[PDB]
Design a binder for this molecule. Structure first.
Ligand SMILES: CCCCC/C=C/C/C=C\CCCCCCCC(=O)OC[C@H](COP(=O)([O-])OCC[N+](C)(C)C)OC(=O)CCCCCCC/C=C\C/C=C/CCCCC
Ligand SMILES: *[C@@H]1O[C@H](CO[C@@H]2O[C@@H](C)[C@@H](O)[C@@H](O)[C@@H]2O)[C@@H](O[C@@H]2O[C@H](CO)[C@@H](O[C@H]3O[C@H](CO)[C@@H](O)[C@H](O)[C@@H]3O)[C@H](O)[C@H]2NC(C)=O)[C@H](O)[C@H]1NC(C)=O
Ligand SMILES: CCCCCCCC/C=C\CCCCCCCC(=O)O[C@H]1CC[C@@]2(C)C(=CC[C@H]3[C@@H]4CC[C@H]([C@H](C)CCCC(C)C)[C@@]4(C)CC[C@@H]32)C1
Ligand SMILES: CCCCCCCC/C=C\CCCCCCCC(=O)O[C@H]1CC[C@@]2(C)C(=CC[C@H]3[C@@H]4CC[C@H]([C@H](C)CCCC(C)C)[C@@]4(C)CC[C@@H]32)C1
Ligand SMILES: CCOC(=O)N1c2ccc(C(F)(F)F)cc2[C@@H](N(Cc2cc(C(F)(F)F)cc(C(F)(F)F)c2)C(=O)OC)C[C@H]1CC
Ligand SMILES: [Cl-]
Length: 472
């Protein structure tokens, strides 16, 4: 099989195995969210006549899930089995001897219902209006025990039988009907939340990415897989341009999470970043002097003194992209070809002596990315600089000046821009909470036409507990 998408997400069986340690927390929440209506009636009891009854204020007093197991059913669903969910309900039994009025006043007995259940939830994943929706219509319950215990162990003779016959049955059906409904709601609440957080991560101000599905998610016995548009949105405008082709053969099934990114995404990124006016840098006096030092060169050297030079607190440097950067995914790395305008101004007392140069050039950099210790790291594999139009805006100019300014662009400009770049993406991910998760041995892999993120993750316990508590 083959798929049309700009971005692809693959969650494998090892990821589901780690997430299965939290299934009980979700199932517990489902029981805790359900609304059990009162069970009332009036039947003629053996030798007693009409007895009007009611099981009121049914609340859970104890819950315990023994173990859960998850299985991927190819082309069908995600099958979760929950064994031995020990439930204890409490409430009030209220009755009256309608016909046998001689038997005294109406009663109110506090009871406990001790039940053991085995569950089977088979969740189907579908594309609903761009987003993944979850539907579990195959939700099953198997009861191991369903015992009533009344305060003081009271028994007139009609209670146990009315509970064994009649009541037992309806209660089993009320429970399944509520529990399954709640599992489906919590399940969709999670899906919705995960997708909202994923869309938040892939956005900054007027820039966002359209992660709308291209088809229903894929279920194999090895993995779960979802295919996304990946079209960039700018100021609430997007274009439904034909999608690249994804091959499920390109991805593995060993790591917990595999992310596929077409190079069109990086191209579409560069376009919006350029148009939003983000691709510019400006350095003033002190900041400019600090940058030169930061790149292993002492400020009070001779070289500096002749040109940077007149007044260090008055020196200006501006870099802006002339046109949109051309990004390409290669086996060797991410290759970025950017047409830049570097402007240098070193004002002197008399505006004649000031050195004013404008370097209009094309810089090609081959980058390699890394993530570790909750930071993004960009390293330079190779580069090429071709000056298109170097210009001097004063009589204060020579070839040695042009060389010092050009060496500055190469030896300081390239490492600093990459340094600032890594900081920005690190801040974005941090602010969007990517650092909250424990990302284990991640690998950024560049290939011809695409990039690949392969990772194992440590699911953070308390954050789910927090989210689960935050419902109504
Ligand atoms: C764009 C990548 C290509 C970069 C290569 C460009 C070639 C170099 C060309 C010219 C050099 C001059 C400009 C470089 C210097 C500026 C570098 C920089 O400092 O910053 C890059 C810039 C934001 O500069 P600024 O003036 O707005 O802020 C300034 C920050 N200060 C307030 C602290 C001062 O532009 C951005 O970063 C744009 C990125 C925004 C991304 C947000 C969209 C959401 C998508 C992904 C992010 C989430 C991570 C998941 C990954 C999914 C894969 C897409
Ligand atoms: C930019 O700098 C030019 C000179 O600097 C250097 O020029 C190259 C040789 C090279 O080393 C390069 O790296 C540097 O940029 C300035 O050009 C000079 O301007 C002078 C004044 O106009 C000029 O002089 C005389 O030129 C003719 C012929 O001799 C006379 O008829 C005239 O009256 C001038 O007195 C000099 O020759 C000229 N040099 C060149 C190579 O053109 C240039 O003006 C300056 N730009 C700005 C905007 O000021
Ligand atoms: C650039 C991008 C880089 C971002 C890196 C972020 C790292 C995140 C790590 C991280 O923790 O990723 C996990 C995010 C949650 C999820 C998607 C996942 C695994 C399994 C998924 C779940 C399987 C079934 C679940 C349904 C709601 C049905 C449950 C029924 C049951 C009876 C309770 C479903 C789809 C919920 C979401 C998870 C991976
Ligand atoms: C004294 C100084 C004065 C002189 C004036 C200065 C003159 C300078 C002029 C020009 C300099 C221009 C040269 C620099 C060119 C830019 C080079 C340059 O660094 O370009 C890079 C920009 C970032 C990026 C798009 C890239 C490649 C890899 C991308 C990344 C791959 C994965 C990354 C995910 C966010 C991480 C997922 C991790 C997961 C949680 C496990 C992702 C998408 C982040 C962004 C990069 C190329
Ligand atoms: C940290 C917040 O983000 C996330 O947790 N993820 C994320 C991140 C990037 C992208 C990507 F690739 F498009 F850029 C998509 C997604 C999410 N996602 C896909 C997805 C896949 C399945 C799958 F495989 F099982 F079918 C199920 C679900 C969900 F939400 F229903 F549970 C979501 C997404 O946002 O889809 C629109 C899934 C999730 C994977 C860690
Ligand atoms: Cl009694």
């Amino acid at each position: 099989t083959s798929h049309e998408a700009g971005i692809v997400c693959r969650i494998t069986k090892p990821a589901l195995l780690v997430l299965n340690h939290e299934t009980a927390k979700v199932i517990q929440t489902a029981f805790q969210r359900a609304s059990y209506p009162d069970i009332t009636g009036e039947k003629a009891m053996m030798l007693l006549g009409q007895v009007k009854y009611g099981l009121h204020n049914i609340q859970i007093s104890h819950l315990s899930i023994a173990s859960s197991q998850v299985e991927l059913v190819e082309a069908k669903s995600i099958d979760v089995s929950i064994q031995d969910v020990s439930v204890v309900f409490k409430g009030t039994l209220k009755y009256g001897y309608t016909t046998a009025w001689w038997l005294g006043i109406d009663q109110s007995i506090d009871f406990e219902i001790d039940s053991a259940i085995d569950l089977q939830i088979n969740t189907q994943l579908t594309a609903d209006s761009g987003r993944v929706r979850t539907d579990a219509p195959d939700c099953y319950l198997s009861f191991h025990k369903l015992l009533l215990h009344l305060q003081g162990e009271r028994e007139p003779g009609w209670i146990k039988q009315l509970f064994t016959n009649f009541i037992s049955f309806t209660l089993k059906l009320v429970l399944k009907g509520q529990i399954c409904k709640e599992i489906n709601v919590i399940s969709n609440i999670m899906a919705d939340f995960v997708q909202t957080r994923a869309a938040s991560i892939l956005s900054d101000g007027d820039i966002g990415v359209d992660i709308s599905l291209t088809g229903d998610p894929v279920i194999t016995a090895s993995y779960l897989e979802s295919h996304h548009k990946g079209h960039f949105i700018y100021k609430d405008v997007s274009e439904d341009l034909p999608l690249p082709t994804f091959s499920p053969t390109l991805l593995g099934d060993s790591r917990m999470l595999y992310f596929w990114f077409s190079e069109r995404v990086f191209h579409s990124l560069a376009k919006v970043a350029f148009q939003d006016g983000r691709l510019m840098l400006s350095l003033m006096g002190d900041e400019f002097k600090a940058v030169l030092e930061t790149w292993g060169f002492n400020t009070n050297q001779e070289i500096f003194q002749e040109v940077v030079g007149g007044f260090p607190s008055q020196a200006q440097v501006t870099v802006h992209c002339l046109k949109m950067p051309k990004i390409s995914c290669q086996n060797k790395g991410v290759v970025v070809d950017s047409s830049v305008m570097v402007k240098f101004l070193f004002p002197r007392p008399d505006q004649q002596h000031s050195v004013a140069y404008t370097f209009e050039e094309d810089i090609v950099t081959t980058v390699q990315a890394s993530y570790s210790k909750k930071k993004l790291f960009l390293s330079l594999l190779d580069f090429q600089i071709t000056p298109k139009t170097v210009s001097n805006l004063t009589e204060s100019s020579s070839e040695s000046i042009q060389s010092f300014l050009q060496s500055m662009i190469t030896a300081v400009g390239i490492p600093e821009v990459m340094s600032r770049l890594e900081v920005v993406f690190t801040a974005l991910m941090n602010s969007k909470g990517v650092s909250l998760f424990d990302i284990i041995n991640p690998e950024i892999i560049t290939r011809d036409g695409f990039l690949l993120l392969q990772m194992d993750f440590g699911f953070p316990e308390h954050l789910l507990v927090d989210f689960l508590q935050s419902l109504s």
